[PDB]
Symmetry: C3
Subunit: 91 residues, 3 copies
Protein backbone atom coordinates (compact mmCIF):
# COMPACT_ATOMS: atom_id res chain seq x y z
CA UNK A 1 0.00 0.00 0.00
CA UNK A 2 0.90 3.67 -0.31
CA UNK A 3 3.16 4.56 2.61
CA UNK A 4 2.87 7.76 4.61
CA UNK A 5 5.98 9.96 4.59
CA UNK A 6 7.48 11.36 7.78
CA UNK A 7 10.05 13.90 8.90
CA UNK A 8 11.44 14.31 12.41
CA UNK A 9 13.40 16.82 14.49
CA UNK A 10 14.46 17.00 18.13
CA UNK A 11 16.07 19.41 20.56
CA UNK A 12 17.49 19.54 24.05
CA UNK A 13 18.17 16.64 26.36
CA UNK A 14 14.64 15.68 27.46
CA UNK A 15 14.36 15.66 24.41
CA UNK A 16 11.51 17.33 22.66
CA UNK A 17 10.69 15.49 19.43
CA UNK A 18 8.37 16.54 16.63
CA UNK A 19 7.32 14.05 13.93
CA UNK A 20 5.45 15.33 10.86
CA UNK A 21 3.45 12.87 8.74
CA UNK A 22 2.19 13.53 5.22
CA UNK A 23 -0.83 11.31 4.65
CA UNK A 24 -3.27 11.70 1.75
CA UNK A 25 -2.16 15.26 1.09
CA UNK A 26 -2.30 16.51 4.69
CA UNK A 27 0.56 16.99 7.16
CA UNK A 28 -0.06 16.46 10.88
CA UNK A 29 2.26 16.63 13.86
CA UNK A 30 2.97 14.40 16.84
CA UNK A 31 4.97 15.66 19.80
CA UNK A 32 7.01 14.22 22.66
CA UNK A 33 8.54 16.14 25.57
CA UNK A 34 9.25 13.31 27.99
CA UNK A 35 5.74 12.33 29.11
CA UNK A 36 3.77 10.78 26.27
CA UNK A 37 3.05 11.47 22.61
CA UNK A 38 0.34 13.97 21.74
CA UNK A 39 -0.99 15.79 18.69
CA UNK A 40 0.47 19.21 17.95
CA UNK A 41 -1.05 22.35 16.49
CA UNK A 42 0.57 21.98 13.04
CA UNK A 43 -1.92 20.92 10.35
CA UNK A 44 -1.33 22.07 6.77
CA UNK A 45 -1.61 20.60 3.27
CA UNK A 46 1.27 18.60 1.87
CA UNK A 47 2.16 15.36 0.10
CA UNK A 48 5.78 15.68 1.21
CA UNK A 49 7.36 17.16 4.33
CA UNK A 50 10.82 18.01 5.57
CA UNK A 51 11.80 19.78 8.77
CA UNK A 52 14.76 21.45 10.41
CA UNK A 53 15.01 23.19 13.78
CA UNK A 54 17.57 25.17 15.76
CA UNK A 55 17.92 26.68 19.21
CA UNK A 56 18.73 30.29 19.95
CA UNK A 57 19.58 29.99 23.62
CA UNK A 58 16.61 28.09 25.02
CA UNK A 59 14.16 29.19 22.28
CA UNK A 60 13.31 26.64 19.60
CA UNK A 61 12.76 27.64 15.98
CA UNK A 62 11.19 25.11 13.61
CA UNK A 63 10.86 25.23 9.83
CA UNK A 64 8.56 22.77 8.06
CA UNK A 65 8.71 22.53 4.26
CA UNK A 66 5.36 21.29 2.91
CA UNK A 67 5.14 20.39 -0.78
CA UNK A 68 2.12 19.77 -3.01
CA UNK A 69 2.90 19.43 -6.69
CA UNK A 70 5.83 21.72 -7.44
CA UNK A 71 4.88 24.25 -4.73
CA UNK A 72 6.77 24.16 -1.42
CA UNK A 73 5.39 26.27 1.44
CA UNK A 74 7.58 27.03 4.46
CA UNK A 75 5.92 27.13 7.88
CA UNK A 76 7.70 28.75 10.80
CA UNK A 77 7.54 28.29 14.56
CA UNK A 78 9.24 31.21 16.33
CA UNK A 79 7.17 31.47 19.53
CA UNK A 80 4.00 33.05 18.09
CA UNK A 81 2.27 30.06 16.55
CA UNK A 82 2.93 28.82 13.04
CA UNK A 83 3.44 31.51 10.39
CA UNK A 84 4.02 31.28 6.65
CA UNK A 85 7.66 31.89 5.80
CA UNK A 86 9.31 33.75 2.94
CA UNK A 87 10.72 30.63 1.21
CA UNK A 88 10.10 30.41 -2.50
CA UNK A 89 11.44 28.12 -5.20
CA UNK A 90 10.95 27.98 -8.97
CA UNK A 91 10.15 24.31 -9.51
Amino acid sequence: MKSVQTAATSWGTVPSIRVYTANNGKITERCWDGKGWYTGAFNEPGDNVSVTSWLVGSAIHIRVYASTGTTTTEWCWDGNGWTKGAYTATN
Copy 2:
Protein backbone atom coordinates in the same frame (compact mmCIF):
# COMPACT_ATOMS: atom_id res chain seq x y z
CA SER B 1 13.74 4.90 -6.17
CA VAL B 2 15.03 4.03 -2.72
CA GLN B 3 14.38 6.56 0.03
CA THR B 4 16.94 7.68 2.62
CA ALA B 5 17.24 9.59 5.87
CA ALA B 6 20.44 10.81 7.51
CA THR B 7 21.65 12.06 10.89
CA SER B 8 25.05 13.04 12.27
CA TRP B 9 26.60 14.00 15.59
CA GLY B 10 29.79 15.47 16.96
CA THR B 11 32.64 16.91 14.93
CA VAL B 12 34.30 13.70 13.68
CA PRO B 13 31.43 13.28 12.71
CA SER B 14 29.48 10.11 13.12
CA ILE B 15 26.89 9.75 10.36
CA ARG B 16 24.07 7.24 10.02
CA VAL B 17 22.20 6.81 6.73
CA TYR B 18 19.00 4.75 6.63
CA THR B 19 17.68 3.38 3.32
CA ALA B 20 14.19 2.03 2.69
CA ASN B 21 14.39 -0.45 -0.19
CA ASN B 22 11.73 -3.02 -1.13
CA GLY B 23 10.06 -2.82 2.26
CA LYS B 24 13.21 -3.06 4.42
CA ILE B 25 15.26 -0.34 6.12
CA THR B 26 18.99 -0.87 6.54
CA GLU B 27 21.72 1.32 8.00
CA ARG B 28 25.19 2.46 6.93
CA CYS B 29 27.56 4.03 9.44
CA TRP B 30 30.51 6.40 9.38
CA ASP B 31 32.60 7.24 12.44
CA GLY B 32 35.57 8.88 10.74
CA LYS B 33 37.29 5.80 9.31
CA GLY B 34 35.12 4.33 6.54
CA TRP B 35 31.55 3.19 5.91
CA TYR B 36 30.22 -0.04 7.39
CA THR B 37 26.85 -1.71 7.85
CA GLY B 38 25.01 -1.10 11.13
CA ALA B 39 22.76 -3.29 13.22
CA PHE B 40 19.50 -1.52 12.34
CA ASN B 41 17.33 -3.72 10.11
CA GLU B 42 13.54 -3.35 10.37
CA PRO B 43 10.60 -3.25 7.95
CA GLY B 44 9.56 -0.02 6.31
CA ASP B 45 8.73 1.65 3.02
CA ASN B 46 9.52 5.13 4.38
CA VAL B 47 12.08 6.32 6.94
CA SER B 48 12.97 9.45 8.86
CA VAL B 49 15.48 9.91 11.68
CA THR B 50 16.53 12.30 14.40
CA SER B 51 19.22 12.05 17.05
CA TRP B 52 20.47 13.98 20.05
CA LEU B 53 23.36 13.86 22.49
CA VAL B 54 23.09 13.57 26.24
CA GLY B 55 26.63 14.56 27.11
CA SER B 56 28.69 12.17 24.98
CA ALA B 57 25.96 9.53 24.52
CA ILE B 58 23.96 9.43 21.28
CA HIS B 59 20.25 8.68 21.20
CA ILE B 60 18.71 7.89 17.82
CA ARG B 61 15.04 7.64 16.82
CA VAL B 62 14.13 6.04 13.49
CA TYR B 63 10.54 6.40 12.25
CA ALA B 64 9.71 3.44 10.00
CA SER B 65 6.42 3.53 8.11
CA THR B 66 4.49 0.91 6.18
CA GLY B 67 1.07 1.96 4.98
CA THR B 68 -0.30 4.31 7.63
CA THR B 69 1.52 2.62 10.53
CA THR B 70 4.70 4.28 11.81
CA THR B 71 6.91 2.34 14.22
CA GLU B 72 9.54 4.22 16.23
CA TRP B 73 12.85 2.44 16.82
CA CYS B 74 15.14 3.65 19.59
CA TRP B 75 18.89 3.48 20.06
CA ASP B 76 19.92 4.29 23.63
CA GLY B 77 23.12 2.24 23.77
CA ASN B 78 21.71 -1.28 24.19
CA GLY B 79 20.42 -2.23 20.76
CA TRP B 80 17.31 -1.10 18.95
CA THR B 81 14.04 -1.14 20.92
CA LYS B 82 10.50 -0.21 19.92
CA GLY B 83 9.40 3.19 21.17
CA ALA B 84 6.06 4.47 22.37
CA TYR B 85 5.30 6.57 19.25
CA THR B 86 1.87 6.19 17.72
CA ALA B 87 -0.08 8.27 15.22
CA THR B 88 -3.69 8.08 14.00
CA ASN B 89 -3.08 7.93 10.26
Copy 3:
Protein backbone atom coordinates in the same frame (compact mmCIF):
# COMPACT_ATOMS: atom_id res chain seq x y z
CA MET C 1 1.18 14.66 -10.47
CA LYS C 2 3.67 13.38 -7.90
CA SER C 3 4.84 16.14 -5.57
CA VAL C 4 8.44 17.28 -5.32
CA GLN C 5 10.47 15.91 -2.40
CA THR C 6 12.56 18.05 -0.07
CA ALA C 7 15.20 17.83 2.62
CA ALA C 8 16.36 20.61 4.92
CA THR C 9 19.24 21.43 7.25
CA SER C 10 20.22 24.46 9.30
CA TRP C 11 23.11 25.71 11.41
CA GLY C 12 24.03 28.46 13.85
CA THR C 13 21.77 31.12 15.29
CA VAL C 14 21.14 33.36 12.26
CA PRO C 15 20.49 30.62 11.06
CA SER C 16 21.68 29.43 7.74
CA ILE C 17 19.19 27.06 6.11
CA ARG C 18 19.58 24.88 3.01
CA VAL C 19 16.56 23.27 1.36
CA TYR C 20 17.11 20.61 -1.33
CA THR C 21 14.31 19.80 -3.79
CA ALA C 22 14.11 16.71 -5.99
CA ASN C 23 11.95 17.54 -9.02
CA ASN C 24 11.72 15.36 -12.14
CA GLY C 25 15.03 13.65 -11.48
CA LYS C 26 17.05 16.74 -10.54
CA ILE C 27 17.96 18.08 -7.10
CA THR C 28 18.49 21.83 -6.65
CA GLU C 29 19.21 23.96 -3.59
CA ARG C 30 17.81 27.13 -2.01
CA CYS C 31 19.75 29.02 0.66
CA TRP C 32 18.95 31.40 3.51
CA ASP C 33 21.69 33.22 5.43
CA GLY C 34 19.40 35.71 7.19
CA LYS C 35 18.78 38.18 4.35
CA GLY C 36 16.61 36.50 1.74
CA TRP C 37 16.48 33.22 -0.16
CA TYR C 38 18.79 32.58 -3.11
CA THR C 39 19.81 29.64 -5.29
CA GLY C 40 22.78 27.52 -4.24
CA ALA C 41 25.45 25.70 -6.21
CA PHE C 42 24.14 22.17 -5.56
CA ASN C 43 22.70 20.67 -8.74
CA GLU C 44 22.89 16.89 -9.19
CA PRO C 45 20.57 14.12 -10.40
CA GLY C 46 18.21 12.45 -7.98
CA ASP C 47 14.62 11.42 -7.35
CA ASN C 48 15.00 11.30 -3.55
CA VAL C 49 17.10 13.41 -1.22
CA SER C 50 18.19 13.51 2.41
CA VAL C 51 20.74 15.77 4.10
CA THR C 52 22.72 16.21 7.30
CA SER C 53 25.28 18.83 8.34
CA TRP C 54 27.65 19.63 11.17
CA LEU C 55 29.83 22.52 12.30
CA VAL C 56 33.54 22.40 13.05
CA GLY C 57 33.91 25.70 14.84
CA SER C 58 32.14 28.07 12.44
CA ALA C 59 32.79 25.98 9.30
CA ILE C 60 29.82 24.04 7.90
CA HIS C 61 30.05 20.57 6.41
CA ILE C 62 27.06 19.27 4.46
CA ARG C 63 26.30 15.78 3.18
CA VAL C 64 23.48 15.28 0.65
CA TYR C 65 22.31 11.74 -0.15
CA ALA C 66 20.84 11.68 -3.66
CA SER C 67 19.09 8.51 -4.86
CA THR C 68 18.05 7.36 -8.33
CA GLY C 69 16.74 3.83 -8.50
CA THR C 70 18.80 1.79 -6.04
CA THR C 71 21.91 4.00 -6.37
CA THR C 72 22.54 6.58 -3.64
CA THR C 73 25.33 9.10 -4.16
CA GLU C 74 26.72 11.20 -1.31
CA TRP C 75 27.69 14.77 -2.16
CA CYS C 76 30.00 16.65 0.20
CA TRP C 77 30.26 20.37 0.85
CA ASP C 78 33.37 21.21 2.86
CA GLY C 79 33.73 24.84 1.78
CA ASN C 80 35.33 24.22 -1.63
CA GLY C 81 32.62 22.92 -3.95
CA TRP C 82 30.45 19.81 -4.02
CA THR C 83 32.42 16.56 -4.36
CA LYS C 84 31.29 12.94 -4.47
CA GLY C 85 31.91 11.23 -1.14
CA ALA C 86 32.89 7.68 -0.31
CA TYR C 87 29.37 6.59 0.81
CA THR C 88 28.27 3.32 -0.71
CA ALA C 89 25.42 0.91 -0.10
CA THR C 90 24.51 -2.47 -1.56
CA ASN C 91 20.89 -1.87 -2.54
